[PDB]
């Protein structure tokens, strides 16, 4: 049947065997839309790893977990969480990854104000990842603060590629409605042909997260937020008058409704706002203390 076909297919691109041959002491530390994140310990070693566990039977778009394992195989980039191995355990896909001990950007945003040196540092790190991914035809399609992980020394890496897509010379655009409603680009909510530009819109929403502490429409039912994103003017900062002209001029190039006028990752990397971008040390205080907005 279709599930057995897909499971056989997935078995062909993952590593063989059971990672319980070398992983001990699984503990759930978090969850996302497709499954849970555990920490585990390499047997006979002190090495800590993160393991994503996704039940195939619960997935709305199982083919995109194929994309994650395949496209991100041995992807080595300073701003991308490293994937080590993948396995099929019963009806679950397990993906063994680097453990980032600074936590997720979501936790920083909810507990503290960030200054613009810190906001620019985070944006620089994400756009360096996206600029390369987009040049290779990879659309992430789930950019948001929960997809951003930090090290204790303040490095910033992108993860959560479970919704990603590959575009090509032959098939340069997608139309699938995929992502997290409050961060979705309007042309994607509209199921119009779209390219990597949808990640740039989502980054704009994450910038609003970093400035305001939440995305626009965050307490609205998700279908209503999607209707307002699709139909209304781009959402604005609640704290509009507390940010510099540089940051607003930057944000104005991300939250552009027309994908053909929205800035690309490579263009944004040249923007004057990112000359503010602080070094890893500027991020470190954000994981150790809180400062209300």
Residue 179 near residue 110, CB atoms below 8 Å: no
Please identify, among the stretches 24-32, 67-75, 208-216, 251-259, the one whose residues bind ligand 8FX according to the rule CB under 6 A: 24-32
Q: In what order do the strands lie in the sheet with 156-158?
A: 103-104, 148-150, 156-158
Q: Should residue 97 be labelled a site residue for ligand 8FX when binding is judged by CB under 6 A?
A: yes
Residue 282 is assigned to a ligand binding site: no
Kindly tell me which of 33 and 246 has the beta carbon lying closer to ligand 8FX.
33
Q: Should residue 101 be labelled a site residue for ligand 8FX when binding is judged by CB under 6 A?
A: yes
With CA atoms as reference, report the closest residue to 204 among 144, 260, 266.
144
E strands along 90-185, which residues?
92-97, 103-104, 138-139, 148-150, 156-158, 165-166
Number of Cα atoms under 13 Å in the Cβ half of residue 68: 30
Query: 40, 50, 108, 164: which one contacts ligand 8FX (CB under 6 A)?
Result: 50
CA distance 256 to 266: 16
Residues 130-169 that bind ligand 8FX (CB under 6 A): 146, 149, 159-160
Residue 162 is assigned to a ligand binding site: yes
Q: Should residue 32 be labelled a site residue for ligand 8FX when binding is judged by CB under 6 A?
A: yes
Backbone region of residue 60 per phi and psi (left: phi > 0; alpha: psi in -120 to 50; beta: other values): alpha
Please identify, among the stretches 62-70, 101-109, 206-214, 218-226, the one whose residues bind ligand 8FX according to the rule CB under 6 A: 101-109
* Catalytic machinery residues: 142
Contacts with ligand 8FX by CB under 6 A lie at 29-30, 32, 37, 50, 52, 81, 97-104, 146, 149, 159-160
């Amino acid at each position: 049947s279709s599930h057995e076909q897909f499971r056989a297919a997935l078995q062909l691109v993952v590593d063989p065997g059971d990672p319980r041959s070398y992983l001990d002491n699984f503990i759930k530390i978090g969850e996302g839309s497709t499954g849970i994140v555990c920490i585990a310990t390499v047997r006979s070693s002190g090495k800590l790893v993160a393991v994503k566990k996704m039940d195939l039977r619960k997935q709305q778009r199982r083919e995109l977990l194929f994309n994650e394992v395949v496209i991100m195989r041995d992807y080595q980039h300073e701003n991308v969480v490293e994937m080590y191995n993948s396995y099929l355990v019963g009806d679950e896909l397990w993906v063994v990854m680097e453990f980032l001990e600074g936590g997720a950007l979501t936790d920083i945003v909810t507990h503290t104000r960030m200054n613009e040196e810190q906001i620019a540092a985070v944006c620089l790190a994400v756009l360096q990842a996206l600029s390369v991914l987009h040049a290779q035809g990879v659309i992430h399609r789930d950019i948001k603060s929960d997809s951003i992980l930090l090290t204790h020394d303040g490095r910033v890496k992108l993860s959560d590629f479970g919704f990603c897509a590959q575009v090509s010379k032959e098939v340069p655009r997608r139309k699938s409605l995929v992502g997290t409603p409050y961060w979705m680009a309007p042309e994607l909510i509209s199921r119009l042909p779209y390219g990597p530009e949808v990640d740039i819109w989502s980054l704009g929403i994450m910038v609003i997260e970093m400035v305001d502490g939440e995305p626009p429409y965050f307490n609205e039912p998700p279908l209503k937020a999607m209707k307002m994103i699709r139909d209304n003017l781009p959402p604005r900062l609640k704290n509009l008058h507390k940010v510099s002209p540089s940051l607003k001029g930057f944000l104005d190039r991300l939250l552009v409704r027309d994908p053909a006028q929205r800035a690309t990752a490579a263009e944004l990397l040249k923007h004057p706002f990112l000359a503010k971008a602080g070094p890893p040390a500027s991020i470190v205080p954000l994981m150790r203390q809180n400062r209300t907005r």
